Structure formats: C-alpha cells, structure tokens
Amino acid sequence: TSFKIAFIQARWHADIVDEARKSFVAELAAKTGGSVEVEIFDVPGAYEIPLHAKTLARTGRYAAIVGAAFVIDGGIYRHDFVATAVINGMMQVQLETEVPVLSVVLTPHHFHESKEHHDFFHAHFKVKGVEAAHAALQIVSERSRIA
Amino acid sequence: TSFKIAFIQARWHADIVDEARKSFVAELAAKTGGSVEVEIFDVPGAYEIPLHAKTLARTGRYAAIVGAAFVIDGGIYRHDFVATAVINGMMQVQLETEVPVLSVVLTPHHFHESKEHHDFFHAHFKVKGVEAAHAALQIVSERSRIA
Amino acid sequence: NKTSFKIAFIQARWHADIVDEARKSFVAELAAKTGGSVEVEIFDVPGAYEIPLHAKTLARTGRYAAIVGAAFVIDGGIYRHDFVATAVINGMMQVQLETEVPVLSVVLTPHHFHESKEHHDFFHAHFKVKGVEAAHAALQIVSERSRI
Amino acid sequence: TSFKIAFIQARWHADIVDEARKSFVAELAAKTGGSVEVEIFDVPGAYEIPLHAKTLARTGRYAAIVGAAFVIDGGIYRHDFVATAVINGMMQVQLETEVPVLSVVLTPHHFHESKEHHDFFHAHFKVKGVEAAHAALQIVSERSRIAA
Amino acid sequence: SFKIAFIQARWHADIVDEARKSFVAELAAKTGGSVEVEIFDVPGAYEIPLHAKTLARTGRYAAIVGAAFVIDGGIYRHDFVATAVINGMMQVQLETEVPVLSVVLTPHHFHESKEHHDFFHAHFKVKGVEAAHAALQIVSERSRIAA
Amino acid sequence: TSFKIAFIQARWHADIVDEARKSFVAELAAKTGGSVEVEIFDVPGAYEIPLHAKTLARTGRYAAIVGAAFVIDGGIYRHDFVATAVINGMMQVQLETEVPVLSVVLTPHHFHESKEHHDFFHAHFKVKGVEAAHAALQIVSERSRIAA
Amino acid sequence: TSFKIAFIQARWHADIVDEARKSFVAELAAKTGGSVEVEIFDVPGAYEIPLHAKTLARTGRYAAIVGAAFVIDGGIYRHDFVATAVINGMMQVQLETEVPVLSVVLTPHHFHESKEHHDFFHAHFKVKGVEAAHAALQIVSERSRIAA
Amino acid sequence: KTSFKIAFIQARWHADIVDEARKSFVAELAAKTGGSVEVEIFDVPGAYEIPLHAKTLARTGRYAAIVGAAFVIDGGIYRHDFVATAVINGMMQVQLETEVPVLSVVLTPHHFHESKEHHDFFHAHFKVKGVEAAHAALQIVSERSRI
Amino acid sequence: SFKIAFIQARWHADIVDEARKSFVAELAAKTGGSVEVEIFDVPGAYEIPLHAKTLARTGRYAAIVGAAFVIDGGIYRHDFVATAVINGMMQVQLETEVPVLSVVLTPHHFHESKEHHDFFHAHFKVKGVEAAHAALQIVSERSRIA
Amino acid sequence: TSFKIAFIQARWHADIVDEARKSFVAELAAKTGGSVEVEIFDVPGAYEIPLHAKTLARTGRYAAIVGAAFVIDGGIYRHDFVATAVINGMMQVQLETEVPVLSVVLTPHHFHESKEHHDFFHAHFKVKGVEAAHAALQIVSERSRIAA
Ligand code: NA
Ligand code: NA
Ligand code: NA
Ligand code: NA
Ligand code: NA
Ligand code: NA
Ligand code: NA
C-alpha cells in the first residue's frame, strides 16, 4: 500500500490553499501511517499546475497527483478562462499520463476578500483536503483492482 | 454472456446514482436476460470517470462503458469546470479508444439537498438508468452492424 | 455531367418525430439536386452524445465524403444539456479534423423548447429547412474538398 | 516579400462576410502589390472552416490561412456551440500545422436581420478585413523572422 | 542563466506594454539582469498560442509569456477568442513541456474611457510583475524537479 | 348580458398584434353573438397603453380593457424596461380604476425579423387572442358575480 | 373565531393549482373544523388576481385573501413581467386595504410541460397549499392580536 | 390643421447622440405639421431628472404630450439599470398621474463602449428614433383628443 | 419612552433568530434597556410589509425591522417575493414616515447544507448588531431633525 | 434670498462616499459663490435614504436633495433589491415632494474590497461628486426657469 502522491499547490490564496494540503496530508498519513508519501510542489498559479502535473506524472513515481488552488473571481479579470483551462488541463494530463489527478482546484460562486468569506473557506478547504485524501486513496486503490 | 459493459459510478450522491445503476443493470437483464453482463466500478467523483473509462475501455474487455454521477451545483463552488471536463473527457476517451462511453453523468439545473429534490432524482435516475440501458444495447448493436 | 458520392446521416433517436424531418428533408433535396447521384445512408444512434464516435467510425471507413449528425439537443428543464451539446458539437469537429471527412452539423439546440403543439410544430417544420440547407452544405463542401 | 494566403469564407451572410474579404484583398493588394496572393475558398458554414483550413494548411502552399464568417445568434438555435468549435478548431489546426490561421469569424453580441444591424456590420466587416490583412502580413513576417 | 519569450499582442499596446515593461524590469532587478527576455509582437491574442508553440519548440526558452488585453469589444464576442487563446497556451505548454505563463487578461468591464484605460494601464504593471515573479518561480520549481 | 371592451393595440408589429385583435374580436362575437362590442384604440407603442387604458377605463363605459402589443427585444435597445413599466402599468391602471385590464402585451424570448419567427407569432397571437377573449368574458362575468 | 378567506385562483394549470386549493381548504378545515370559511374565486390567469383580491378585500368580508396560480415560463413568452406585476399587485393591494393577501402564486425555476414536472408540482402544490393554510391562520390571528 | 405644444426633455448626457433625436424629432414635426406643433426643449442633467421635470411640465397643461430623451448606457463602471428603470417607470408614473402622454426616447442600448463605430451608429440611429417619437407624438395626441 | 417593532418571518427561524436575539442584545446594550423591542412573529417575508404598516400606523413604534431569510429554495423563484417585500417595507415607510429597517436578507447562495446553515446562523448575529446600530442611528437622526 | 441642498450620505463606505460629498460641496461652493448651504445628513445605509429624503424634502427647506451611498454586491447577500428600492425611492419621493432628488447612490459592477478597487472608487467618487454638484445646480436652475 506504499505509494507516492504529488500535491501541487498554487502560491495564491495560500492561507486557504494550505488548509487543504495540511488536511490532505493529515488524512492521508493518518490512514497510511507514512505508507502513502505525499510529496509537495509549489507552483505560481493554478495555471501553472497542469504542466507540472504532467511532468511529475511522467516520472512514474506517483500513483496520483493533486492540484490544489483557489481560483476566484478576482473582481478585476475573468477567472473562468483559466479555471477552465486548468480543470481541463489536469483532466487531459491524466488521460495522457494514465495517472489519476484529483482536483482540489476550487472556484467558489462568491468570494470577496473579507473575514467572513476568508474564514469560511480557510475552514472548508480543510474538509476538501480530507475529502481529497479519501478520494486520492480510493482511486489509486480501485485502479490497482483493475490492473 | 454476449458482451460486457463497465458501469463507472461516482461515490457522491450514491443514494441517487445507485438508483440509475440499479435500473440500468435491471433493464439490460429485462432486455438481454443476462446475455449482457454489467460490471460495476466505483470511483470517488465524476472527475475520475474519464480516466477510469479510458483505462477500462482500452482493456478491450467492454463493448461499452457507462459513466454515472450526479454532478450538481454544490452550493459552494462551481460544478461546471468539473462537469465539462467530465462530459467532454468521456467524449474524448471514447473517440480515442472507439469504445462507446454513454453518459449518465447528469447535472440538474437546481438541487438543494432537500427532501423534495432528493426524492425527485432518486426517482428520476431510475428512468435515466433504463434509458442508458436501452441506449447502450442500441449503440452497441448499431456499431457491430457497421464493421 | 454528374459526379456521385456517399453521405452517412447519423441521427439520435430522441425527438425522432422532429429529427426525422431533417433527415427526410435532407434526403429529398439531394434527390432533387443529385437524383440519386448522391446516396444518403442513415444510421440510428441513441443520443446526440453517441454521434461523434459513430461519425468517426463511419468516416474512417472512407465510404463517405461527408458525415451528417442530426440531433435535437434540448434543455429538458431537468438536466443541463449544454455539457453534452458542447461535447457533441466539439466532438464532431474533432472527428472531422481527425478524419479529414466533413461532418456537417444538424445537431441543433433551440433557445427555448417546452413539449407543446406550438413548439413541436415549429421545429417539426423548421427541421425541414435545416435539412435542405444541410444538403446544399453537404454538396457544397464535398465538391469544394474535391477541387483540392 | 511574396507568399500565399488561403482565405476560407462561409457562404452565410455573404453580403457582410464578403466585405471583410474584399477589404482583406484590397489591403494586401496595396501593402504588397501583387506579392501576397490571396486564394479564396468558399465553404457552406463556419463549421466547415476548421477542417478546410486544416486541409489547405497541410499543403504547405499557404503562409497563413484566414477564416471569415459572420456567426450570429439566429434567434432560433444557439449558435455559440458552433462558434466555440470553430474558433477553437482553427486554433487547433494552426497549432497542429503551425500555419497561422487568422480569425475573422466574428460573432456579434446582437444582430436581428434589420437594416441598421445589417448595414453596421456590412460596414464594419470592411474594417475587420483590413485588420485581418495587417494581422496576416504581420504574423507572417514575424514568423519568418523568428525562423531565421 | 536562462531566456524567456515574451509574446505580446499589438492590440491595446499602451496597456499590454505596461505589463511587459515591468516584467522585463522585475526580471532585471530580480536576476541582476541574468535572464534574457526576448520580446515578440503578434497581431492579437489569437496569434499567441501558435507563436508560443513555435518559440517554445525551439528549446531556447525556459518559459514563455503570453501577454494580451482581450476585452469585450462591445461589438463582437471576445470570450470565444479568449478561451481559444487561454486554452491554447495551456495546450501548447503541455505539448511542449515549456511553461507558458498567461498575462492574457480579460477584464470584466472596459469601455476605453479615461478612468478605465488608466486603470488597466496601471494594473498591467502590477500583473507584469507577478508574471515576472511567476516565471522565475515556475522555471526554478521545474528544474528543482529535473534534478 | 352585454358590455363593452376597450381593445388597445400598439401600432408596432401590427401584422402580429393584429392576428390577436382579430381572433379576440371574433371569438367574442362568435360566442356572445355580437352582444359584446369590442372597441379598438390604436396607440403608438406598448408604452402608450397604460395611460390609454386608464383614460378609457375611467369613462366607465368598458367592463374591461385589453392591452395588446408585441414587445420584442429589437436587438438594439433593451425592451424589458418598457415591458416592465407596461405590464406593471396596466396592472396599476386596473387597480386604480377597478376595471379589468387583460394583457396581450407579449414579450417573446426571441424574435428576429425572420420568416419562421414572424409566421410563428402571426399564428400564435391568433391563439393568444382567443384566450384573452375568454379571459375577458371570464373576469368580466366573474367580477359581476362577486358584485351581486 | 369565524372569519372568511377569499381564495382566488387562476384556471391555467388547474390540475396543479387545484391541489393547493384542495390542500388549503382541507387542511384549513382540519385545523378549524369549518370555523374558517374558505370562499373560492376563479380568475382567468394570475394577472387578474390582484384586482379581484382588491375588490374582494374592499368588501371587508374576508380576514385574508389567497392568490393561487402557477406562473410558468411558457417557453414562448417571458412570464416574469406578469409574475412580477402580480406578486407586486397582491403586495400593493394588501398594503392598500390592510387585508392580508398571501401568495401561492408560484413561479418555479424550471417546468417544461411533461409528466416529470407535472407530477412533482401537482404533488408539491399540495404542500404549498397546506403551508398556505397555516400561513393564513397565523397571520389572520397575529394580526387580530395587534387589535387588542 | 390642429396645433399643440410638446415638451421635449433631454438629458445632457451623451447629447452627442441624444441631440440627434431631438433634432430629427423637431425636424419631422416641422416637416409633418408645418410648425403647427411646437416642440419646446428642456435640458436636464441626467435621465433620472426627467420624470420630475416631465411631471412638473405636465401639470402645467400646456403640453398635449411630453417627451423624455436620453441615452442611458452602461458606463461600464456603475450599473445603469437601476436608474434606467426608475426613469422609464417614472415617466410611466407621471403620465398616469397627469394623464399627459410622456413618450420615451430614453433608450438604453445593449452594448456601447464609446467606440467611434458605436458612437456613430447611435449618433446615427437616434435620428431614426427621434423621428419615430414624432410620429408617435402626433399619433397619441390625436388619439387622445378624440376622447 | 420609545419602542421598536421587530417583524420576523418564521421560515429559517433558526437563522433569523440570531439576527433577532443579536438585535435585541445590542439594542438593549447601546441604550441601557431604555428601548423596548416588540417581537412580532409573522408567516413569511411577504407578510412583513403589511404588518410593518399596520404597526407603523399605531404610532407606538419609532422604527420597525423586517427580519427574514429570503432564499432561492431551488424549486420556485424567490426574487419575486423578495423584491415585493424589500420594496414593500420601503413603501410602507414612506407612507408612515416611520423607519423600517431591512433584515430581510437574500443570500447569493444558500443550499440547505450544514456549512451554509452554519455560516449564516453566525452572520445573522453580525447583522442583528448592524440592525440595532442603524435603528438607533436613524431613529436618532430623524429626531435630530423635526 | 438663499438656498440649501440636502445631502443625505449613508454611513457605509465613508472613505469613498465622503469623497463624493467633499467634492460635491467643494464644487457647489465654487459655482455658487458660497451661496448654497449643503446640509449633511448621515444615514445608516442607502435604504434609510429615501425616507430621510422625503422627510427633508417636505420641510421645503431644500431646493434639491442628493442621496449618496456606495451600494455594492457584498458577495454574501444580494444588493440589487435594496439598491432598487433606494433608486426607486428617491424617484418616488422627488415625484411626491416635487423636490429634485439626485442620486449618488452608485452600484458598481464589480467591487471586491481590494486595493485597486478601493482606490479607484475613492478617486472616482470625487468625480461623481462633482457631476452631482453640476447636476444639482443645473436642475435647480432648470426648474427655476420653468415656473414663469
Ligand atoms: Na448518453
Ligand atoms: Na453544418
Ligand atoms: Na485574428
Ligand atoms: Na520587439
Ligand atoms: Na405568503
Ligand atoms: Na414611445
Ligand atoms: Na425606453
């Protein structure tokens, strides 16, 4: 049950993005006891995630890859174009590399820099992190059942 | 056993998704008498269907692959990005392996985890499962009729 | 002074009453304009989602100089259609670039459409137009690709 | 210097899309004086452009391709699904043939077959034609430049 | 040390420029001027993907930057092109393995009024800097993996 | 058993608005044997309906008023503002005057001056006009019942 | 005590609207065993509800008024204008006459005339009817509380 | 030949265009009523200042009909609809009040980015609307008189 | 002394209450129990305007507060009622010349989940506070005039 | 004699709204040789503006009233309902009192409390504040011209 997962996280909204990484690694290492090794990679923005996901996936060292990012409507420029390119990007990379890439690259309906908002997500990203972990494990497992 | 069908269903909303998987398997039997055997593969979320579809398709074991998941606007984050990446992804995967990927990866216009809503889709997926069942039998047939 | 070829008309079983209208119409014009010179072979596919692949499978047989995907992709009020429509409209596009075999789209998505004598009648009738057009488009693009 | 440009135009809304073409041609005529040859290629709809461009692009005959079409919202069926596939498609081709495919496949925000509207674009497509020409000349030279 | 291909659309130069100007500037300041930044002018954003691909493919750049101000013209629908482009780069960078940072911004609103114009003229300087801080960021991070 | 009805119709899209007026004016006669008279008042556009209805209603000669217009989205300027002000306007006038004011001030989801469109509504307003006709006899008679 | 309620309902979609009416009257009885008298009034469509409600409220005979109608997006014309005018009407009327006018004039997000939807709303209206009853007994009570 | 006075209230905003409607308005009326119909202009800050002016003017009884003219565009910075509504509704409210026809040439275009082409188009198109307003002006004034 | 009328819709009571309780809490605080907040329960938001009126007319209240959680249920449109209400209070207050504050909130998103319910249960307290501060401020400001 | 203007500014977003006010007063001060007395009235939110506006308008003390507030999409609850009631309110009021009520109750399209944002509008409200001043004076003037 020993396998490596590459956790790529955007440097943006790190205060929140990290809560997921932390929760993720937590949940993981807390159901694998170090068996599942979570390597962590920092990328500038969500947009730099996919390629990174590919390069890492091609090393063949990871049984799964995790893209973590908080893609928000910055209020100034449109996020969805990237948001799309990134969700598609990963999807493409996993179909290319045959390496599961889970998406914890979330985009909320709303989110204006402010406490009320920030808090909520800083919190909720911990749930996603967990969920991610379970998902990371479940898929890597199910994949083995097949092969 | 004339032919196999991989039914890849997501974990989320299994309460409802299951309703479609159950009616899908049932109909195949009602229509084929067990001639066609359906094999169920569980996966975390809809996002893991494409690759799982790819992987399975490529084994050549199945004459068709069904992807089922209830992808809804999850109150907090946008669902599109994922859904699109999924519906498109399967489309990609079938065009790539020439193995039909039927989609039962539905996205309702509205859905608030409420009694009314839940019971509607719990009831509806049954319908959608019976249709997918028929669709499969058909497209599978139609295709053999081609070569 | 007549050249001939084969067209593969793929149509989704959903809304057949309406879709058929395009098919029947598509076929009728090519009969008027080509008088059998151009043969239209019809393939029934479940949903619009089942078109891109069938089209690719058929286009690769090289028997056809053009594939036609006819489908009435609607917003059923229950689930979102666009995800699939997209996948399909894109899908055919992908196929044609992959097989360099023209795949015309008669896979239409109305802005609004509630089951009803008024709506149904409208498209039932309108698909007859969209079918003729598809014909002239089929002929037009097939001939043009030949010139090359 | 001299090179050839393949101009692919959809037959729909000819009166308008034609304007862009004429402008395109004239501009280049001016800016190159018979040096740059623009080969016109008709195609039924915008959907028919991608593949077409893909086919011409592969001949290596053209230094750049230009898809021209006025894709609007017909008011009956959603257009975008197509516009998307077309705008994405041409991109798909240029990226896979490394042949610049300039886009003059414009999609107005609003456009009911009215006088005002028709006259506006019929007029505006002329401006678009010129830009396309410059964009053409510019992208063609900028490439051969980063190629030396 | 390394080189970066900065492909900028000619449209909305007064603005896009401000982004390039600060990009090159930041890199000089941050790399003591050890990172060569080659500038490439393309007609419009739609022309960027291909140019990124050709340059990227030359294997002369550690990363590529696509800069363009793709706004809603008011006459025609931009998002189509916007998407084609933002996607393209994504496509291209996976294809090439060369990272393509995006400074192809599509503001929510922009009517070329004094207020507006000056606003993005100012912001693109900011955006150009982040681009710089993202380029070095990604290029570094990558090699780190390559060792 | 008899009473008068004020039929206020916008002059825009008479061709379509008319089909309703005619349906209405006939359906009534053909169901009250000319007992009920329908008086037609032309007015420029929908916007000019509310006030007209108020003025007419206040004369107390009509048992009810019917505003009929085709408030389309011209594609140039936004129709909704007027549309809102009008549907609300008639609602306002009918509450003031306590005289029914049926609304055949329809706003289609789409309408581009096209054959298909124009025909569809030309045919529909006929229907909508009959309904309004019944709704009139209904509400009038009904308010009468509640009175006694 | 013995007070009366004016239940105004449109004909359109009676099959569904009625369930609410029935649920309302039934359940209302069940909580009042006939103490509260529910007087039903038929009106063509939602648009004629405000006025009727007004006229009826003014009689002073009712302690509350209920508006029942299913204002759907017919798919052809925009409903919201009316939907609005009507919800605002009842609102206006209740403010103008200080006679509670509860709204069971529901406009669902999606509803394309099919068995799917029909059944759901034919059934759900039964709920909205029960709630409407409670809402009525509640407001009529809480109001008379303020009387003391 | 009948003769009546009309009060044309125009918002000073975008007079570049609104003026075109005013001119063609008076133009037509001249040409169509040989001067028997007097149009009296009233300048007002913004569209929002029309309803009140309309009412003030209406109450005098000197006008058979009032015309509110203004181009209420989407500034691109603040939402214009809130105002557009109050004004279009206000004029409605006022005409209902005074029972003096208040025609609306307070147009709100779908798109408008102070382009040269946009500006030319509307500078051009208002002429039409202005005329159309004149016709309706005579139209309703005459139709009311007959009561 | 002066008293305020708090008209609270019952739907989503759990969430609205916080606003109420919080409102009353802050109000008594900033005014050492000198202000009497009269709570009036009412079915749904739609019933808030008329009540706010019937009360406003009594003369008894210095200001009225409509409180409700107008959500997009996912089945029928809310905006219609929401508007009619938010407009209604606005109207009733111009009629009665009695401040009527709005704590009739319509969240951008709210799907009956634990996260949402939890968030808003909290936020409505923050709102009740602001409601109190406004009530005082405007009740004050109005008297600062006349 | 002398004249005053009632400037009702909402407490929220003072940093920004204040600019509109300061420059509003600044301009009028200039343009009227200081003969205008711009009385400031603070109010919790934009919602409390209408009533204040009416209360103040009735006094007859002011020749014009200005409502100022920065109503935005707070990302949590919807603003538009309130924004509407406000913009409408002021309109309702001035029509009632026949006292010009100018609106500096601006709602921007996007405003995520960021630096670039906060600064933009802080700088902008200065402008709008001046616009409002030139408007206030312009209308007061204009009306002063009407009554002969
Ligand atoms: Na399917
Ligand atoms: Na086609
Ligand atoms: Na181009
Ligand atoms: Na250069
Ligand atoms: Na109610
Ligand atoms: Na008019
Ligand atoms: Na208007």
Q: What is the CATH number of the domain that holds C139?
A: 3.40.50.960
Tokens of F50: 């509310």
Strands A62-70 and A101-106: parallel
Residue H9 β-bridge partners: H42, H68
Q: Is G26 an interface residue toward I (CB < 8 Å)?
A: no
DSSP element (H, E) containing B129: helix B115-144
Q: Which residue has the tokens 């909320």?
A: A108
Spell out the long-range contacts of D16-21 with Cβ–Cβ below 8 A and sequence spacing 24 or more: D16/D70, D16/D118, D16/D121, D16/D122, D16/D125, D17/D68, D17/D69, D17/D70, D17/D125, D18/D125, D19/D122, D19/D123, D19/D125, D19/D126, D19/D129, D20/D68, D20/D104, D20/D125, D20/D126, D20/D128, D20/D129, D20/D132, D21/D68, D21/D129
In the three-class reduction of DSSP (H, G, I as helix; E, B as strand; rest coil), residue B41 is classed as strand
In what side-by-side order are the strands of the sheet with H4-11? H37-44, H4-11, H63-71, H102-107
Residues of B classed as catalytic: 78
* Torsional class of D37: left (φ above 0), alpha (ψ -120 to 50), beta (otherwise): beta
CB proximity list for C113: less than 8 A, separation 6 or greater: C74, C75, C119, C123, G75, G112
J84 membership: H or E segment, kind and range: helix J80-93
Cα-Cα-Cα-Cα torsion I45, I46, I47, I52, nearest 10 degrees, comes to 80
Number of C-beta neighbours around residue E94 at 10 A: 19
B72 is in an annotated binding site: yes
Residue A82, token pair as written in the block = 């990237």
Mind spelling out the 3-state secondary structure of chain F? Answer: CCCEEEEEEECCCHHHHHHHHHHHHHHHHHHHCCCCEEEEEEECCHHHHHHHHHHHHHCCCEEEEEEEEECCCCCCECCHHHHHHHHHHHHHHHHHHCCCEEEEEECECCCCCCHHHHHHHHHHHHHHHHHHHHHHHHHHHHHHHHHC
CB distance B47–A102 less than 8 Å? Answer: yes
Distance CA H89, CA H104 (A): 10
Q: Report which DSSP code applies to G109.
A: S
Closest Cα partner for A109 from H71, I110, E113, B93? I110
Q: How far apart are CA F2 and CA F145, in angstroms?
A: 14
Q: Which residue blocks in chain C are alpha helix, DSSP H?
A: 16-34, 51-59, 82-99, 117-147
* Beta pairing partners, J70: J106
Contact at 8 Å (CB) between F103 and F7? no
Q: Is J115 on the interface with E (CB under 8 A)?
A: no
Q: Is residue G116 less than 8 Å (CB to CB) from chain B? A: yes
Closest CA to B48 of B95, B82, B97, B24: B82
Concerning whether H12 is annotated as a catalytic residue, the answer is: no
CA distance C44 to chain D (A): 23
| Residue H55 sits at the chain J interface (C-beta within 8 Å) | yes
Q: Cα–chain-centroid distance for residue J108?
A: 15
Q: Do chains B and F touch (3 or more CB pairs under 8 A)?
A: no
How far is the alpha carbon of E44 from chain H, nearest alpha carbon, in Å?
A: 19
Residues 6 or more apart in contact with residue I69 via CB below 8 angstroms:
I9, I11, I12, I15, I16, I105, I107, I110, I120, I124
Q: Which of E124-138 are b and which e, b meaning 16 or more Cβ less than 10 Å from the residue's Cβ?
A: bbbbbbbbbbbbbbb
Contacts of A142 in chain B (CB under 8 A): 41-43, 52
- Comparing CA positions, the residue from D110, D97, D105 lying closest to residue D59 is D97
**What gap in Å lies between CA G137 and CA G31, rounded to an integer?**
9
Q: What is the distance in angstroms between the Cα of I23 and the nearest Cα belonging to chain B?
A: 28
Token pair in block for residue A70:
């908080």
The dihedral built from the CA positions of residue B48, B50, B56 and B58, taken in this order, carries a sign that is: negative
Q: Residue G88: list chain F partners with CB under 8 A.
A: 88, 91
Backbone phi and psi for residue B17, each to the nearest 5 degrees, phi listed first:
-50, -50
Q: Per the CB < 8 Å rule, is D54 touching C97?
A: yes
Residues shown for chain J? 148
Instruction: Look at G124 and B116 and tell me if their CB atoms are within 8 Å.
Output: yes
Q: Describe the crossing of helices J14-31 and J115-146 by its angle, rounded to 10 degrees.
A: 40
Please give the backbone phi and psi of residue J126, each rounded to the nearest 5 degrees, phi first: -65, -50
Whether residues J113 and A110 touch (CB distance < 8 A) is answered with: no
The span from the CA of D90 to the CA of D96, in Å, is 10
Q: How many of the other CB atoms lie within 10 Å of CB of F146?
A: 14
Binding site members of A for 5-amino-6-(D-ribitylamino)uracil: 12, 46-48, 70-72, 103
Sign of the dihedral through C-alpha J85, J91, J96, J100: positive
SS (H, E, C) chain D: CCCEEEEEEECCCHHHHHHHHHHHHHHHHHHHCCCCEEEEEEECCHHHHHHHHHHHHHHCCCCEEEEEEECCCCCCECCHHHHHHHHHHHHHHHHHHCCCEEEEEECECCCCCCHHHHHHHHHHHHHHHHHHHHHHHHHHHHHHHHHC
Task: For B7, list phi and psi in degrees, rounded to 5.
Answer: -110, 100
Query: Parallel, antiparallel, or unpaired: how do β-strands A3-10 and G64-70 relate?
Result: unpaired
Q: How far apart are CA J37 and CA J6, in angstroms?
A: 9
For the range J24-31, what are the long-range contacts, defined as Cβ-Cβ under 8 Å and sequence gap of 24 or more?
J24/J66, J24/J68, J24/J104, J24/J129, J24/J130, J24/J132, J24/J133, J24/J136, J25/J133, J26/J129, J26/J130, J26/J133, J27/J129, J27/J130, J27/J133, J27/J134, J28/J133, J28/J136, J28/J137, J31/J133, J31/J134, J31/J137
Distance CA F6, CA F66 (A): 6
Is any Cβ of chain J less than 8 angstroms from the Cβ of A113?
yes
D94, E49: Cβ pair inside 8 Å? yes
Structural domain boundaries, residue F145: 1-148
Phi-psi region of C115 (alpha: psi -120 to 50; beta: other; left: phi over 0): beta
Counted domains in chain E: 1
Map tokens 């084609």 to a residue.
E84
Give G109→chain F minimum CA distance, Å: 15
**Cα G126 from Cα G122, distance rounded (Å):** 7
The alpha helices in chain E, defined as continuous H runs, are 13-31, 48-57, 79-96, 114-146
Residue whose tokens read 């619009």:
C48
- DSSP code for C35: T
Cα–Cα distance for residue pair A9/A104, rounded to 1 Å: 9
Torsion-angle region of residue A108: left (phi > 0), alpha (psi -120 to 50) or beta?
Answer: beta
* Cα-only R_g, chain F: 15
Q: How many angstroms separate the CA atoms of J102 and H52, rounded?
A: 11
Identify the residue whose tokens are 């820099």: A113
**Beta-strand runs (E) in A24-130:** 36-43, 62-70, 101-106
Shortest alpha-carbon distance between residue J129 and chain I (Å): 23
Length of chain C: 148
A87:B85 CB<8 A: yes
Residue keyed to tokens 């930057």: E65
Q: How far is CA I63 from the centre of its chain?
A: 10
Q: Compute the distance between CA of residue H130 and CA of residue I13 in angstroms, rounded to an integer.
A: 54
Alpha carbon of J134 to ligand 5 centroid (Å)? 46
Beta strands per DSSP E along chain J: 3-10, 36-43, 62-70, 101-106
Locus of tokens 């009497």: I36
Q: Do residues B9 and B113 lie in contact, with contact meaning Cβ atoms separated by under 8 Å? A: no
- Indicate the angle between helix axes A14-32 and A115-146, nearest 10 degrees: 40
Ligand 1: distance of its center to the CA of C112 in Å? 21
**Is E145:A56 a contact under the CB 8 Å cutoff?**
yes
Residues B67 and B9: their CA atoms lie apart, in Å, by 6
Please tell me if residue H4 touches chain D, with a CB cutoff of 8 Å. no
Interface mutation vs chain H, best among J81, J101, J109, most H CBs within 10 Å: J109
CA separation for the pair H108, F81 (Å, rounded): 9
Residue F81, both tokens: 């503002």
Listed residue (D57, D70, D62, D65) closest to D19, CA to CA: D70
Chain G partners within 8 Å of I41 (Cβ): 138, 142
Distance from C-alpha of G7 to C-alpha of G28, rounded to nearest angstrom: 12
**Residue pair A93/A53 in contact by the 8 Å Cβ criterion:** yes
Residue D131, token pair as written in the block: 């830009």
Which one, of H76, H71, H147, lies nearest residue H109 by Cα?
A: H71
CB < 8 Å from J in window 57-76 of A: 73-76
Backbone angles phi, psi at A83, to 5 degrees: -35, -50
The Cα A141–Cα F100 span in angstroms is 69
J32: three-class secondary structure by DSSP: coil
Residues whose beta carbons lie less than 5 angstroms from ion ligand 2: C 104-105; D 45, 47
Which of A88, A100, A107 lies nearest to residue B85, judging by beta carbons? A88
How far apart are the C-alpha atoms of D50 and A46, rounded to whole Å? 30
DSSP secondary structure string, G54-92?
HHHHHTT--SEEEEEEE----SSB--HHHHHHHHHHHHH
- Residue H78 is given by DSSP the state B
Cβ pair D43, D8 in contact under 8 A? yes
Size (chain D), residues: 148
The answer to whether B75 touches I72, Cβ cutoff 8 Å, is no
* Partner-chain residue, chosen from A86, A135, A147, that has the shortest CB–CB distance to B45: A135
Contacts of G111 in chain C (CB under 8 A): 77
Alpha-carbon gap, residue H62 to B98, rounded angstroms: 79
Q: Which residues contact E65 (CB under 8 A, 6 or more apart)?
A: E4, E5, E6, E7, E23, E100, E101, E102, E103, E131, E135
Give the containing element (helix H, strand E) for E65.
strand E63-69
Q: Is I53 within 8 Å of chain G by CB?
A: yes
A12 touches chain E (CB under 8 A): no
Question: Which residue has tokens 């029934």?
Answer: C44
Give the residue from chain D lying closest to H111, CA to CA. Answer: D109
| Distance from C-alpha of F84 to C-alpha of F47, rounded to nearest angstrom | 10
Phi, psi for residue J81 in degrees, rounded to 5: -55, -60
Residue A83 contacts B where some CB pair is shorter than 8 Å: yes
The residues placing their C-beta within 5 Å of ligand 4, an ion, are E 39
- Exposed/middle/buried for residue G3 (C-beta within 10 Å: 0-12, 13-18, 19+): middle
Burial code of J73-100, b = ≥16 C-beta within 10 A, e = fewer? Answer: bbbbbbbbbbbbbbbbbbbbbbbbbebb
Distances (CA, A) of B81 to A87, B47, B52, D86: 6, 10, 19, 21
The Cα-based distances of F106 to F66, G47, G71, G82, J148 in angstroms read 12, 13, 14, 10, 43
Round to whole Å and give the CA distance between J107 and H81: 10
Residue J77 CB contacts under 8 Å (≥ 6 apart), including other chains: I105, I106, I107, I108
Distance (Å, whole) CA E4 – CA E37? 5
Q: Which of E20, E77, E142, E144 is catalytic?
A: E77
Report d(CA F46, CA F35) in Å as an integer.
Answer: 28
**Closest chain D residue to the Cα of F78, Cα to Cα:** D110
Q: Which strands, in side-by-side order, build the sheet including J101-106? A: J36-43, J3-10, J62-70, J101-106
Q: What is the CA radius of gyration of chain H?
A: 15
Query: How many CB atoms neighbour CB A118 within 10 A?
Result: 15
Neighbours of J120 (CB within 10 A): 22
List the end-to-end C-alpha distance of chain J, in Å, as a whole number. Answer: 18
Strands G64-70 and G4-10: parallel
Q: Under DSSP, is residue J43 helix (H, G, I), strand (E, B) or coil?
A: strand
The chains found to touch A (3+ Cβ pairs under 8 angstroms) are B, E, I, J
Distance between CA atoms of F89 and F10, rounded to whole angstroms?
A: 14
CA dihedral (J113, J116, J122, J123) in degrees, to 10, reads -160
Closest ligand to Cα F76? 7
Instruction: Determine the distance from the C-alpha atom of residue C6 to the mean position of all C-alpha atoms in its chain, rounded to a whole number.
Output: 14
Q: In chain I, which residues have their Cβ closer than 8 Å to the Cβ of B75?
A: 109-111, 113, 115-116
Q: Which residue has the tokens 């028709």?
A: D118
Q: For residues D96 and D87, what is the distance between their CA atoms, to the nearest angstrom?
A: 14
Going by C-beta distance under 8 Å and a sequence separation of 6 or more, which residues neighbour residue C32? none
Rounded Cα distance between E83 and D85, Å, is: 11
Those residues whose C-beta lies under 8 Å from the C-beta of residue E61, and which sit 6 or more positions away, are E2, E3, E4, E5, E38, E55, E98
Spatial distance between the Cα atoms of H109 and H73, rounded to a whole number of angstroms? 6
Tokens of A16: 């929140």
State the alpha helices, DSSP H only, in chain G: 14-32, 49-58, 80-97, 115-147
Residues with CB under 5 A from ligand 1 (ion): B 102-103; C 47, 49
**For residue I33, is it left (φ>0), alpha (ψ between -120 and 50) or beta?**
left
